[PDB]
Amino acid sequence: IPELRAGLAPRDGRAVEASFGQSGIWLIDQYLPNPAAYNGPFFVRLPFSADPDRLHAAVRGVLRRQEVLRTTYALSDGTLRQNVSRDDDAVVFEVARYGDDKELDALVHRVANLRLDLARGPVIAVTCALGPANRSAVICNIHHIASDAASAGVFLRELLDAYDRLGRGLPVEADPLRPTYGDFSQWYRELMNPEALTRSLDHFAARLAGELPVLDLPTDRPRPPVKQHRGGTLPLHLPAAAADDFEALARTEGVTLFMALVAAYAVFLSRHTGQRRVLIGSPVSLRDDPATHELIGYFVNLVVLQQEIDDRMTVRDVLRRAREEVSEALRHKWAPFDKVVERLQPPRSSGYTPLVQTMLVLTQGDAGRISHDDTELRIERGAAHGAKYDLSLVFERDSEGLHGLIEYDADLFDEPTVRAMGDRLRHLMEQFARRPDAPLHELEALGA
Ligand SMILES: [K+]
Ligand SMILES: [K+]
Ligand code: NA
Ligand code: NA
Ligand code: NA
Ligand code: NA
Ligand code: NA
Ligand code: NA
Ligand code: NA
């Protein structure tokens, strides 16, 4: 994997082709809601009362430092291009007030429900929310084509740095030595040369050959002819003790926390659906190179994980099988998801996604929190989304430990059905940590 370098893309004004990820997203763009919440609009509670004029000036400084925020998109001769403008004020901005969490969440909903224009911009919105004494919040929506979950922490770190510099009368300008998203886009095209691309597409095409299962969860409603894009969320409420034993389980069995979550979720899906084979999508970060860690952009590729489950496997068996599947997938993680779909030529339907109908995410680092000025600031996500998937399981591990959230499609589910699912999943995860040797058929269902 070659290092990413600044200037790989022409610095002479010519528009770089959109990245593989961006191309996939632009082709989907209707005026639909954000497809998921975990990578969508976000806010941060600040322990001071931000000055609005200086905060707006700080935002302009972030636009100057983050070229993807100044990028719009257009087809030119059959190629989707990244057109970069010099307008550092291309942001949907407002100053508003809140006196309690309800009023703050109302401001969050207004930002979160914006439908930003990829051809004309802006591709970012920021609200400076002024709260009760010494409290304020920054609310932000960066279009999916221009961001990923980690971009939220990158944005806030850059914003707060700029706010502080401006306060001190210091300049806030682009770092010419940092690579751009345009540089990354060209680097990725060079990495996916014809041989390398064919090799990774060949891998998934073999792994995922034949008649793939379509997730068959019990639902409260049949899938409707007209999808309404109405996403819900519900906390998993995984006890802190079990969450800690689950992390210990992963460590002692020699798998990553993500591998163990994949395994537990696959057993949950297999039980609920009745299906032996289950497919789980996961958005894998492409920020391997430290040169990408301070950039806003779409540095993710969706991979498909296939698991087979039966009730004579042990907890340990399914952890080890998750380890093998995840290990092999991550080796081939640069093969763009939409090209995998194209190779597999799935039978696609309106409403249900290609290849995968559910996802599992583990939120880490800049997607969940930052430190600024020796203060830990949590990145909080809005709850509105378009329910691209039937269900998404979004996990995060903080100091109190690991916690989870279920993003779900309200076209299919009433909330008490999702609460029941979440109860069964957390129960399974607690059993995993207690009985790693047990055959799955000995892990009794909740309420037996
Ligand atoms: K519709
Ligand atoms: K980062
Ligand atoms: Na916060
Ligand atoms: Na707002
Ligand atoms: Na609720
Ligand atoms: Na079923
Ligand atoms: Na990322
Ligand atoms: Na078997
Ligand atoms: Na893609």
Residue numbers in the entry: 80 to 527
The authors write:
Nonribosomal peptide synthetases (NRPSs) produce small peptides as secondary metabolites in fungi and bacteria. Tomaymycin is synthesized in Streptomyces and Micrococci by an NRPS consisting of the initiation module TomA and the elongation/termination module TomB. TomB contains a C domain (BC; TomB91–533), an A domain (BA; TomB534–1055), which functions to load the ppant arm of its PCP domain (BPCP; TomB1056–1141) with 4-ethylidene proline, and a reductase domain (BR; TomB1142–1535). The C domain binds two substrate-loaded PCPppant domains—termed the donor and acceptor PCPs—and transfers the growing peptide chain from the donor PCP of the upstream module onto the aminoacyl subunit carried by the acceptor PCP of the same module.
The crystallization construct comprised residues 1 to 533; however, the first 79 residues did not yield resolvable electron density, resulting in crystal structures of only the BC domain (91 to 533) and the preceding 11 amino acids. (A) Crystallographic structure of BN-BC at 1.7-Å resolution (N-form). As other canonical C domains, TomB80–533 consists of N-terminal and C-terminal lobes, which adopt a chloramphenicol acetyltransferase fold and are arranged in a V shape. The N- and the C-lobes are shown in light and dark green, respectively. Two crossover elements extend from the C-terminal to the N-terminal lobe: the “floor” loop between β8 and β9 and the “latch” loop between β10 and β11. The two cross-over elements—the floor loop and latch loop—are shown in red and beige, respectively. Also highlighted in red is the junction between the N- and C-lobes. The catalytic tunnel is at the interface between the two lobes and includes the conserved motif 222HHXXXD227, where H223 is fundamental for catalysis. In both crystal forms, the catalytic tunnel of BC is wide enough to accommodate the ppant arm and their substrates at both the donor and acceptor sites. The tunnel is ~38 Å long with a minimum width of ~1.4 Å at the bottleneck, as measured by CAVER 3.0 (29).
